[PDB]
Structure formats: C-alpha cells, structure tokens
C-alpha cells in the first residue's frame, strides 16, 4: 500500500521501549483521536438583544 | 606500632587504583540505592558502560585549612557536583576539557549520562591536633530558592553527611545514588541548564581546628577528596567538537 510503504529501510538503532501510550508514566493511555474528540469544546457563542428578535 | 612495620593496613582496590586506609570509616548514603528502570524509556540507543575506566577511583582536590581561619561553618569545599569533579581539568583559559582524564574520556563523545557517585575524604593529622569536619551533599541544591540559608553546618547536620574527627583521623565515604529531575544529565552546554549539575557537595568546619601554642607545631592540615562513578551509562554518541564547554559558574 503506497501510503505506508517503506522501501529500503536503513535503521541505525533498535526501536524505543514502549510506555503503553503513556500508561506507564501517566495513568492513562492516549492511543486514539476519538477519545480526544469527546472532551467538550466551544461551538457557537453569541449575544441576542431585544429588537433583533420577533 | 607493635610490629616492625607499623601495623596492618587495609586495602580498597578498584580497577588499577589501590587505596590504603588504616582506620574505621564513617559512611552514609544520600538516598535509597536502586536499579534504574525507566532510563531505558529515554533513549533508543544502547547505553554504553565503561567499567574499566569509570569504576576507578580518582583524586579530585587538596584543600588546605589553617588554625588562624577556622570559623564554625567555614566552607572548605562548596562545589556543583559532579560538575566540579568532571570539569576539574582546565586549560590556560580555565575552559574545561574531558580529553585528558581517562575516567572522563567518555563524557567527551557522548551527550547524556547517568551514574552513582562515591566521595571519599582523607585527613592525615598527627595525634595532638583536634578538630572536626562535616561533608554533606544536597541534591540539586543550587536550584533551591533559599540555597544560601542552608550552608550553615546546622543545616548540613540534616542532609546526608559524614563526619571526620581529626583527633581520631578516620576515613569517610558518602555514597550518592543518581537522582535527578530527568533520567539523564547533559555532558556539555547544548540546545540553548549547566552540564552535570546534580547537586552541591559541601565541606564545613563543624568544630574549628585547634593545635598547641608551640612554634614548630603544624598550623595547617590538608583535606583530600577521591571520587568514583558506579553504574555509569552513556548515551548519544556525537563528535567531541560538535559542542563546546564554557568556563564554569561559581556558587556564592
């Protein structure tokens, strides 16, 4: 698959040991964007006056 | 002395150095000794160990203290440590260099390191002088918001220390396990923090040094310091000239 394709890899060292996505040093695992997307964020913020109503 | 040679001396050999000691030491450990585990999380390159080089003991300073100048709490040694010991070898411009001393040769080619230290202090008085010294070590003391109130020997009596009685003339050994804010220390001035600044080693004058009023008696006495690294691990091989050393900052 062309998106992840890695031809002729030259790697000088071993790979780095894992912290289980931060669960080793912090308490939680940040492995997924769907969990970050469930923390609330602002959507629309406005003001409404009498006289620009009905 | 009851034998033809005086008595049986005791020998402490590490690598190709051998240190004679005739008396009972005075020991302490700056914190609990452990085996480093999270340090593997910091670097993907293999940590290099040089036991033949670094385990070896090394003579560090000789500081002289006199009868006329011994207050209570006069500081003979006040040093950023290991910074002062590792950067002890200076050129004409007082710029340190890790190239000459074979214990410090791997600090030259690496970026980061980690290791435990053992500082050992030697005082060789005759029998008729009496005094007392305290040598204590404060983990990252220089960065502390009141570092200059903790220099009184009344404060050092609390942090891990050893005592050297000049009347008895004993040895003293202070083991310092590696502890720091990060799993490694920097060896040079990079990424513009000072290199290899893990704490502060003090030598104060707990009881001032006193001798007899006779004219030919010694009015001075020497203090020598030996240091050695223990689990030394180096990582991040680079060129020796890729980073520079600048002359060290002194403590107030």
Automatic annotation (TrEMBL), chain A:
Highest taxon of the lineage: Viruses
Subcellular localization(s) per the UniProt record: Host cytoplasm; Host membrane; Virion
The protein's name: Genome polyprotein
Organism from which the protein derives: Slow bee paralysis virus
Source lineage: Viruses, Riboviria, Orthornavirae, Pisuviricota, Pisoniviricetes
Entire protein: shown range: 889 to 942 of 2964
